[PDB]
Design a protein around this ligand. Structure first.
Ligand code: CDL
Ligand code: LMN
Ligand code: LMN
Ligand code: PC1
Ligand code: 3PE
Ligand code: 3PE
Ligand code: 3PE
Ligand code: 3PE
Ligand code: 3PE
Ligand code: 3PE
Lengths: 85, 78, 85, 75, 101, 81, 494, 186, 74, 85, 39
């Protein structure tokens, strides 16, 4: 997951660099107006972060290894709430 | 049937939360913009309206002259 | 209500973990479940309050990070999606 | 062993011998084909590569307030 | 306009934000010039902070209609984002420039 | 069965099978401390919530009872004619 | 008697009382330790009084006392935002360093306390002097007390360690001295208020830059010039290690703000791609190396190398965020690395007598207070949010990425490896099986002393991690003065 | 230009002659009776090595000067590189070859860049008070001089940056610069 | 079934009380003590950060345009 | 980017009910392959084609064997070389 | 296989009056289909 957060951290850098802040009402107010290449740079980064925390084919190996915890933890954190971050 | 006492950790946290609530409320400027009694003391003591501006200017000018006098002595014609 | 949904699980986790000696096993189970249930109920109301009547709720508490252009606040925002999840 | 008495540990001779070899290893380094190449890879090439990329791309971009119809390339 | 508070009297720059006409030997006036450079830069940037703030309230208030109603507030921030940045006094102190060039 | 455990280890989480004889009492005091902070937070969240839209009177919006922004609006809106 | 001069005088009075009290009372060793501790407490109390009176938006140096009796080598003291928090960090840390050794010295206690008290006066003098030669005089004055501290109270390899830290620092500082003397010759003076006003020619700035950077790279340290840290920070006594990592590493960082950013901005701008290559290399090579380090203090010592690279990259970013992040990360690393050395050099090494990681396992089972603080310090060393370590890392890395993206991405990768080596160490010590079978005697958990020097360190990082504004509010206007550049439409108002 | 072979011979002779001096002292300080002909028998290698380093050094710098068609500090360091390399070859150890080449080439190059006063520093023959005063008070300079050394961008955005920025992009990418208005009313 | 809470805090056996090494006095009252006192004085400290000075000027300068509304026009 | 209108109307009925057809069909083969036939699968298992397929899918496409050896241990050897050389 | 066998679009792209240019952010943003090139 920390690998994903590095990509996500870089993604917020690209938001901060282009928009001055990373608050939701600002990013989405200016989204239709910024460089298309910027959005790809932005967009790719958080998808990789999203890839790690939702176990996509690249970073996916933690979720089944993460079944070494107690069963309710598997149900709550690793099957219905966090994987959906 | 041993009983576990509350201990000191409970009181510090509750006391800290209670003190934080009390201290913040009494430190507010109030409905009006007039500062508190203690607010005016911390401004009077830290006035320094131009004191750092005066002292610094004389120090810089004095050392600039001092550098000038050495430049004269160090570059004198042999 | 909007900010109570935030701190209630936090308080329940602090007491159970840092005072498990004081409340004991059943005391911890009583607080974590009660704090989560009370929090759970308030979310159901928030779904009606925000999702159904379309009132997004903005709550800003204090600044977190403030450097020149970056003003990141401990601010919370309720809209349709956050009450859905 | 130290100035302040500690607990009794099962100080394993093998592990003690391993931790001494590591602390003394610098005394036995030698210049060979292998040790020269590795020491040249890490110290010169990889740093000079990053320095080349850093030098070549310094000022290449600015993201600040970039819009559609305006590129990111700065140079 | 908002009245100038007592605090915003002791820190007003009595000098323009420039280095033309400043004798660098005289310390008070050079320091005042550096103060005027920085404070103007910060004043210009907190404009973006207030515009950003207003745009946030506009965005939520307008919901889906934010793409059509918050336009004036959108551009004003974008102009500020293009221009405002605390860059320091050091370049301008060390490098004179003229428009008639 | 219960696994053996050292009696000399002090852990704030309670340890291995900790349940003090006064667990019911302490669970009530901590609940009260938990309750008071939530009340303190609820009072804060009532004061500083921000809404740009006002709920219709008939709809089920239970926050209108305790928040200041809506209560001030409804109090002012009651003046008709 | 200025408050700043009071700061340098209190620890000297403590030295006097420590070395004379036997003529007024065989005096007990507890007396010496109490004199030294109270001495550092009153020094902390004075630094807190100064901070209350300190003004956040003044370009004048504050609490300066007029000398006017000019000599060749005079000591002028003054404080602004960039120096105020380093002074506070020195005054907070040193009492913790004194308590961290309360029971573990047991011999030459008078010498240990006098050396520790003298180090406080010198390190504070470094952050307070308003002259570039004055800066150098105090940056180097600490070597002989440091040399004798390690040799008197260090571990088995303290002879090689004390030589390494002395000779590395002197050799680099000699190149910084050459650069400093060139500046004073051209300008006639090294006083800050008039040396910053001057303008050096580009090639002069270039050669001035190498001389200064060679010293700041030995002290950062950068990777490849860091042998001295591996030896000294491990072989030193615990108090020495805390001071060495949490205060002495910061002198080169504070020195970049006073010696190169204001006077060498063209050189700094044109050479960033060299600083960033070294900074990027240090982030990777150190991170990989500490993953394979088997001495627990050397692992924690090696982490300091990786983090120091991140705030070294920040100070050269020429951005408001990078510079604020660099001071905040240097401050954050001061608390967290101090706690990790207390955990390793103080808690583990006093119980076992060894620092090899092979001998530790399952310590959580018998020591849940140590593991609770150790984990929070392992999170903070990994840059986890709600620690001041995250706010500093994010702001420092954002500036690095904006100034030069290729170095930012590589320096960003430290988000993986800091976590990697910090959590891996944590598991091999606190988790990872049941209590190690090598321990014959059972271990006790944290004593009240160990709990409260860790709770204090984890409180500072967490509170500052939730509200970093306490520190950022006093850095905004002064940090602004060191930025070099202009905007197309804001420059040259008329 | 210069004669590389002729200069090297003079280079080989001058520092080889001192080696011949040091060789005679070894023969003089020799304990066992070896006669006068041990100048070239037991110590001839010593004098030969000196004549080799001095020859290699003066050959290559002269050669480096011919190849580069310039006279600067680079040539003495290059001269010292082979001079250092030659001494290492006598020990028959590759690290000795590289290290002594590095040592010699560095000292002999910083000696020529700095111009060590061992023969005398260059006298400025000017009012040395005036040079210091100019360097002391040159506190503000024309922006063009800085722009030559530091260039444009990297946070250095002088007035008129955006106009020339569009022109540079058009010349390189053939794309007109025109940011879109963010207001629907425009 | 549950065990009664056990364990020795600070290693103190149930028979005796924690012994003081002498650091507790200065540390709890001089170090932490002064750290709470300073915190109290910080609530009353005047706000001299550049930002709030700048927001006040940024406000008026924005009120000269149509972005903000003047509480006291003219 | 809206495609929802075509989803309700343009989609053909066969593809709309196609997942149900496979769901209610392939259940019976799986239910017949056990407790009714119960040996067709083992015949596939003990062939050389089935044995290689079975393990590959059981070893999770091998995206953890190349991870552990060519990613994780590469870094560990890189750290080894830097400390020792 | 899918590239050689996949159905063509069975509906003309929807057209919004005025292109929704004002509602999507004016001419400076991306608008919808309005009497545009066939696809
Ligand atoms: C900064 C606050 C925290 C901020 C956030 C920090 C977040 C990271 C930390 C999180 C980790 C916390 C660790 C768990 C703590 C509790 C578990 C434990 O270890 O108990 C062992 C043990 C407590 O066991 P106990 O049976 O209850 O007490 C018996 C001890 O013998 C009692 O020993 P004691 O009597 O020596 O303890 C009191 C001690 C207090 O020492 C201190 O000064 C430090 C605390 C100051 C807080 C401000 O000294 C004193 O006696 C009083 C002298 C000084 C008082 C002030 C005087 C001012 C005079 C001038 C005006 O440790 C302690 O003594 C705790 C002391 C500090 C407690 C702080 C509050 C704890 C809150 C717990 C929840 C944390 C939530 C975090 C936010 C979410
Ligand atoms: C995590 C990212 C995930 C991946 C997403 C990538 C998405 C794509 C982004 C790629 C990007 C973003 C910068 C990345 C880093 C910036 C911040 C880092 C991240 C911040 C967190 C890097 O693109 C760079 O690549 C360089 C390669 O050398 C080139 O530099 C120079 O190359 C040589 C001259 O071209 C020089 O000789 C050499 O001297 C330079 O060096 C440039 O192409 C450019 O600077 C910009 O790509 C874009 O550049 C522009 C100009 O090209 C293109 O526009 C086109 O220009 C016309 C002719 O081109 C076309 O006619 C026209 O149709 C179109 O208008 C775009 O089409 C696109 O290409
Ligand atoms: C890592 C060492 C950096 C130490 C910092 C030295 C402090 C600055 C001196 C650098 C130096 C020689 C450098 C020679 C090689 C450097 C070491 C070689 C490798 C070291 C093993 C620049 O020397 C050059 O300076 C240029 C002007 O800037 C001149 O043009 C050149 O002619 C001159 O040679 C001396 O010049 C300097 O002297 C001052 C008079 O007080 C003059 O005003 C300037 O003349 C000034 O520049
Ligand atoms: C960011 C740094 C941390 C900031 C927050 C600091 C804490 C804030 C409040 C956290 C919630 C309360 C946690 C209580 C956990 C249970 C108490 C405990 O430590 O028991 C020790 C327990 C003892 O519990 P025990 O009762 O089972 O002990 C006896 C049995 N043995 C000894 C065998 C275990 O020790 C452990 O087993 C675990 C060791 C590691 C402990 C880590 C606990 C969590 C610490 C806080 C995590 C904060 C996460 C921050 C996330 C950041 C997000 C960006
Ligand atoms: C790990 C923690 C991470 C925290 C991250 C930062 C917070 C984000 C997550 C929490 C979100 C909600 C935070 C709490 C919001 C409300 C705080 C509060 O209690 O305010 C009430 C009090 C008076 O209100 P007042 O500010 O005067 O309103 C008018 C001013 N215009 O205002 C006050 O000033 C009173 C302050 C009282 C002390 C603080 C109370 C904190 C409540 C949460 C405590 C959590 C820790 C628990 C510790 C152990 C408890 C057993
Ligand atoms: C238990 C004890 C707890 C610690 C109590 C002290 C620590 C408090 C920390 C915060 C202090 C806040 C109070 C304060 O602001 O004091 C400021 C004090 C006011 O004095 P003032 O009139 O302003 O004179 C200034 C001249 N430059 O400024 C002063 O002049 C005080 C001067 C103190 C001199 C100390 C000399 C050495 C003492 C050892
Ligand atoms: C934890 C909850 C802390 C209490 C939350 C509310 C505190 C408060 O009432 O405000 C105090 C102060 C003002 O907030 P400020 O950041 O300046 O900007 C807000 C815009 N009105 O903001 C502050 O100074 C809050 C300081 C919080 C310090 C961290 C507390 C950590 C507790 C563990
Ligand atoms: C458990 C999980 C339950 C499902 C979780 C998702 C919830 C939303 C899923 C869909 C629910 C649809 C709404 C269900 C009830 C619909 C309804 O019509 O209830 C009527 C009730 C009256 O509300 P009101 O607006 O005042 O009506 C005025 C009309 N003249 O409207 C109401 O608001 C009454 C319901 C209030 C429920 C509060 C529960 C607190 C616990
Ligand atoms: C602000 C500018 C300040 C300028 C300098 C002003 C003075 C600074 C201090 C200089 C030296 C002062 C020495 C103070 C201690 C003298 C009193 C004394 O006698 O202490 C004796 C002490 C213990 O010895 P004793 O108790 O007699 O034997 C017991 C055996 N069971 O034995 C000791 O304490 C010896 C301690 C070890 C040696 C000191 C640390 C190394 C110092 C290197 C000296 C050379 C560099 C000097 C640097 C000065 C500061 C920069
Ligand atoms: C600039 C400074 C240049 C170095 C100055 C001195 C260089 C030198 O003479 O080093 C000799 C050294 C010989 O190394 P070696 O033969 O392997 O013997 C090792 C036994 N411990 O050789 C070396 O260690 C390094 C050889 C390569 C140097 C490349 C530069």
């Amino acid at each position: 997951n920390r690998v994903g957060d590095c990509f996500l951290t870089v993604g917020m850098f690209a938001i901060l660099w282009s928009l001055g802040n990373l608050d939701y009402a600002t990013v989405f107010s200016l989204a239709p107006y910024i460089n298309s290449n910027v959005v790809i740079i932005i967009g790719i980064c958080l998808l990789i972060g999203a890839m790690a925390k939702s176990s996509q084919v690249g970073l996916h190996v933690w979720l089944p290894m993460a079944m070494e915890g107690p069963t309710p933890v598997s149900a709550l954190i690793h099957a219905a709430t966090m994987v959906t971050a | 049937n041993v009983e576990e006492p509350l201990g000191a950790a409970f009181y510090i946290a509750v006391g800290g939360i209670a003190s934080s609530f009390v201290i913040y409320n009494i430190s507010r400027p109030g409905p009006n913009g007039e500062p508190s009694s203690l607010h005016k003391w911390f401004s009077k003591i830290s006035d320094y309206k131009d004191e750092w501006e005066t002292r610094n200017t004389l120090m810089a000018a004095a050392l600039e002259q001092a550098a000038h006098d050495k430049h004269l002595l160090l570059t004198a014609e042999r | 209500m909007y900010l109570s949904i935030i701190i209630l699980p936090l308080l329940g986790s602090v007491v159970s973990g840092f005072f498990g000696r004081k409340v004991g096993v059943s005391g911890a189970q009583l607080i974590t479940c009660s704090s989560v249930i009370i929090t759970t109920i308030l979310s159901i109301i928030a779904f009606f309050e925000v999702g159904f009547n379309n009132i997004p709720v903005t709550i800003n508490i204090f600044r977190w990070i403030d450097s020149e252009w970056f003003i990141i606040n401990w601010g919370f925002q309720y809209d349709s999606l956050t009450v859905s999840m | 062993m130290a100035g302040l008495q500690h607990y009794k540990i099962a100080m394993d001779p093998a592990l003690v011998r391993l931790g001494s070899m590591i602390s003394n290893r610098y005394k036995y380094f030698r210049w060979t084909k292998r040790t020269a190449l590795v020491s040249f890879m890490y110290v010169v090439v990889v740093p000079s590569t990053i320095g080349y990329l850093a030098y070549k791309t310094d000022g290449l971009w600015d993201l600040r307030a970039k819009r559609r119809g305006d590129l990111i390339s700065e140079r | 306009p908002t009245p100038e508070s007592e605090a915003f009297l002791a820190k007003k720059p009595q000098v323009p934000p420039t280095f033309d006409g400043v004798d660098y030997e005289d310390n008070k006036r050079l320091k005042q010039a550096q103060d005027a450079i920085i404070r103007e830069q910060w004043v210009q940037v907190m404009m973006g902070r207030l515009v950003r703030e207003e745009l946030s309230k506009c965005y939520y208030r307008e919901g889906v209609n934010h793409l059509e109603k918050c336009g004036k507030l959108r551009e004003r921030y974008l102009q500020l984002l293009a221009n405002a940045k605390v860059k320091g006094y050091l370049f301008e102190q060390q490098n004179y420039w003229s428009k008639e060039n | 069965p219960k696994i053996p455990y050292p009696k000399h280890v002090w852990s704030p989480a309670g340890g291995w099978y900790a349940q003090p004889a006064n667990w019911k009492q302490n669970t009530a005091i901590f609940g009260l401390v938990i309750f008071g902070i939530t009340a303190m937070v609820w009072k804060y969240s009532a004061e500083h919530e921000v809404r740009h839209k006002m709920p219709e009177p008939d709809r089920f919006y239970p926050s209108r009872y305790w928040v200041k922004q809506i209560k001030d609006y409804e109090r002012a809106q009651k003046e008709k004619q | 008697m200025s408050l700043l001069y009071v700061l340098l005088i209190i620890p000297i009075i403590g030295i006097f009382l420590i070395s004379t009290i036997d003529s007024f009372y065989f005096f007990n060793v507890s007396y010496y330790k109490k004199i030294a501790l109270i001495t550092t407490i009153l020094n902390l109390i004075v630094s807190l009084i100064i901070y209350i009176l300190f003004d956040f938006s003044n370009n004048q140096f504050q609490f300066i006392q007029e000398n006017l009796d000019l000599s060749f080598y005079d000591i002028y003291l003054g404080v602004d935002g960039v120096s105020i928090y380093f002074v506070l960090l020195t005054t907070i840390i040193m009492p913790i360093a004194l308590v961290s050794n309360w029971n573990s010295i047991t011999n030459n206690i008078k010498s240990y306390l006098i050396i520790m008290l003298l180090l406080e006066t010198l390190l504070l003098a470094v952050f307070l002097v308003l002259d570039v030669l004055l800066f150098y005089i105090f940056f180097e004055s600490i070597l002989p007390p440091l040399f004798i501290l390690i040799g008197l109270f260090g571990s088995s390899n303290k002879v090689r360690a004390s030589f390494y830290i002395f000779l590395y620092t002197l050799l680099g500082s000699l190149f910084l001295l050459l650069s400093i003397l060139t500046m004073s010759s051209i300008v006639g003076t090294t006083y800050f208020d008039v040396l910053l006003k001057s303008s050096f020619e580009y090639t002069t700035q270039l050669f001035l830059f190498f001389g200064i950077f060679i010293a700041f790279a030995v002290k950062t340290p950068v990777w490849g010039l860091n042998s001295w840290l591996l030896r000294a920070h491990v072989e030193s006594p615990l108090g020495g290690s805390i001071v060495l990592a949490a205060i002495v590493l910061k002198l080169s960082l504070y020195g970049v703000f006073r010696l190169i950013l204001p006077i060498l901005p063209q050189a700094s701008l044109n050479l960033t791609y060299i600083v960033y290559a070294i900074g990027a290399i240090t982030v990777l090579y150190a991170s990989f190396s500490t993953l394979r380090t088997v001495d627990v203090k050397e692992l924690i010592a090696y982490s300091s190398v990786a983090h120091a690279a991140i705030y070294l990259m920040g100070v050269f970013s020429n951005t408001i965020q990078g510079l604020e992040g660099a001071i905040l990360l240097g401050l954050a690393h001061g608390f967290v690395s101090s706690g990790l050395f207390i955990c390793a050099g103080g808690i583990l090494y006093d119980r076992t007598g060894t620092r090899l990681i092979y001998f530790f396992r399952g310590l959580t089972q018998i020591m849940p207070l140590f593991s609770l603080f150790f984990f929070i310090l392992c999170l903070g060393n990994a840059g986890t949010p709600l620690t001041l370590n995250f706010v500093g890392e994010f702001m420092s890395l954002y500036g690095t990425l904006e100034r030069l993206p290729i170095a930012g991405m590589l320096a960003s990768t430290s988000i993986i490896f800091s976590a990697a080596y910090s959590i891996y160490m944590y598991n091999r010590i606190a988790f990872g099986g049941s209590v190690s079978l090598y321990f014959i005697d059972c271990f006790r958990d944290l004593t009240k002393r160990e709990f409260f020097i860790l709770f204090t360190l984890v409180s500072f990082t967490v509170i500052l991690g939730i509200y970093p504004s306490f520190v950022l509010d006093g850095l905004h206007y002064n940090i602004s003065s060191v930025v070099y550049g202009i905007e197309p439409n804001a420059s040259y108002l008329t | 230009p210069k004669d590389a072979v002729h200069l090297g011979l003079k280079g080989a002779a001058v520092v080889g002659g001192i080696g011949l001096l040091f060789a005679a002292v070894r023969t003089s300080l020799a304990r066992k009776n070896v006669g006068p002909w041990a100048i070239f028998t037991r110590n001839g290698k010593l004098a030969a090595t000196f004549a080799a380093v001095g020859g290699a050094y003066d050959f290559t710098r002269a050669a480096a000067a011919n190849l580069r068609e310039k006279e600067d500090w680079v040539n003495n360091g290059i001269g010292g590189l082979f001079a250092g390399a030659t001494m290492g070859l006598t020990t028959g150890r590759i690290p000795r070859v590289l290290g002594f080449a590095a040592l010699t080439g560095v000292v002999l190059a910083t000696a020529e860049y700095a111009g060590s006063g061992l023969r005398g520093v260059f006298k400025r023959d000017v009012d040395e008070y005036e040079r210091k005063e100019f360097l002391r008070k040159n506190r503000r300079r024309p922006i063009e001089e800085t722009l030559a050394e530091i260039g444009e961008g990297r946070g250095i955005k002088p007035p008129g940056y955006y106009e020339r920025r569009a022109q540079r992009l058009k010349e390189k990418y053939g794309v007109d610069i025109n940011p879109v208005c963010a207001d629907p009313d425009q | 079934q549950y065990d009664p809470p056990t364990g020795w805090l600070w290693g103190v056996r149930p028979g005796e009380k924690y012994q003081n090494e002498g650091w507790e006095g200065p540390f709890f009252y001089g170090f932490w003590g002064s750290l709470i006192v300073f915190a109290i004085a910080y609530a009353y400290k005047p706000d001299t950060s550049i930002q709030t000075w700048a927001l006040e000027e940024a406000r008026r300068r924005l009120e000269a345009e149509g972005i903000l509304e003047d509480p006291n026009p003219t | 980017h809206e495609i929802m209108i075509d989803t309700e109307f343009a989609v053909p009925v066969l593809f709309k009910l196609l997942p149900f057809i496979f769901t209610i069909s392939f259940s019976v083969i799986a239910l017949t392959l056990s407790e009714l036939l119960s040996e067709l699968v083992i015949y596939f298992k003990f062939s050389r084609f089935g044995y290689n397929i079975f393990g590959f899918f059981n070893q999770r496409f091998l995206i953890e064997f190349f991870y552990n050896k060519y990613i994780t241990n590469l870094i560990l050897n890189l750290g080894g070389q830097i400390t020792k050389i | 296989v899918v590239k050689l066998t996949y159905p063509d679009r069975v509906s003309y792209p929807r057209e919004f009056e005025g292109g929704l240019e004002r509602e999507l952010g004016g001419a400076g943003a991306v608008r919808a289909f309005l009497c545009l090139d066939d696809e």
